[PDB]
Amino acid sequence: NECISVKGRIYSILKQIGSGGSSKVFQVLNEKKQIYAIKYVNLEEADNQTLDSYRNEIAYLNKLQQHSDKIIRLYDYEITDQYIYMVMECGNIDLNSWLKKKKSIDPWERKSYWKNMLEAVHTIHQHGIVHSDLKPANFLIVDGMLKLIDFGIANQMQPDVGTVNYMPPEAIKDMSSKSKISPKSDVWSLGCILYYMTYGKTPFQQIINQISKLHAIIDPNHEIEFPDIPEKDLQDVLKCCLKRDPKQRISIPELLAHPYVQIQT
Numbered sequence: 001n002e003c004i005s006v007k008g009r010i011y012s013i014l015k016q017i018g019s020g021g022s023s024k025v026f027q028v029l030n031e032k033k034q035i036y037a038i039k040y041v042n043l044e045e046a047d048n049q050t051l052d053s054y055r056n057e058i059a060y061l062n063k064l065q066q067h068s069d070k071i072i073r074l075y076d077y078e079i080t081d082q083y084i085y086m087v088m089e090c091g092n093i094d095l096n097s098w099l100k101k102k103k104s105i106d107p108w109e110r111k112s113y114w115k116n117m118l119e120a121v122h123t124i125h126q127h128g129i130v131h132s133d134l135k136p137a138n139f140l141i142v143d144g145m146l147k148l149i150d151f152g153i154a155n156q157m158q159p160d161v162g163t164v165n166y167m168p169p170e171a172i173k174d175m176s177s178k179s180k181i182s183p184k185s186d187v188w189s190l191g192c193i194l195y196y197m198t199y200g201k202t203p204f205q206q207i208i209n210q211i212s213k214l215h216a217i218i219d220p221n222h223e224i225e226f227p228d229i230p231e232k233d234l235q236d237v238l239k240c241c242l243k244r245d246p247k248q249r250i251s252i253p254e255l256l257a258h259p260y261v262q263i264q265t
């Protein structure tokens with residue numbers, strides 16, 4: 001019977017979906033038994049640097065949603081010095097958890113999920129965000145669509161051990177300290193997700209030891225395996241996305257003109 005009020009509406013807590021730093025996300029119902037997700041952030045312990053991360057998420061979320069419905073909706077929010085409440089579109093489940101239920105992936109549904117991810121990542125790029133750490137967890141399934149929930153700025157949360165299987169080569173090499181943030185590095189992480197959606201595993205998921213995994217990502221003569229597949233366009237998408245040179249990696253605008261997106265067979 002736990003409750004939350006936001007602006008002038010009361011919401012009943014069905015369950016806590018997840019949590020992270022000082023944040024928690026709940027599945028809730030409004031006055032009329034309509035379902036929502038509410039993110040709660042406890043701002044009491046919060047340095048002025050995290051405070052600004054949460055403020056930035058809210059502004060972009062509020063701006064970015066006029067421009068695409070593949071971004072999760074933020075309906076209303078309340079922020080004070082002590083807390084934040086965000087009332088949002090509630091997803092059936094995140095893509096990481098839905099992929100780990102290692103079930104069949106329909107080819108047409110994988111194609112349409114890919115379109116969804118490209119559109120969402122495209123619109124954040126048009127407003128100057130590079131997410132930089134995309135993962136399946138960042139996408140939610142809602143009415144047969146994928147919708148992005150993070151812009152990669154605020155504290156990332158876990159359902160109620162991070163991952164590295166999606167990290168792009170530029171991120172590793174650009175640790176040895178003009179360390180630019182290229183839109184190309186989101187293509188790599190999208191490429192890894194589609195790979196996982198194609199072949200049931202991350203490119204370098206086999207390398208269970210993690211220092212050696214980091215080297216494979218950055219080593220040119222470590223070949224990624226692209227087993228031949230009936231969808232020849234899909235195999236090609238995965239090849240152009242997982243090129244180690246970001247300059248030669250395919251771009252999002254190119255990916256939207258690619259036969260895999262554009263020819264419906």
Ligand SMILES: Cn1cc(Nc2nc(NC3CCCCC3)c3c(C#N)c[nH]c3n2)cn1
Nearest residue numbers: 018037088089090091092093094157158159
């Ligand atoms: C597993 N699962 C997820 C849902 N639905 C859902 N999860 C959300 N966050 C989850 C928090 C843990 C990590 C994965 C996302 C949000 C959300 C934010 N932030 C805004 N709407 C949401 N809907 C149902 N089951």
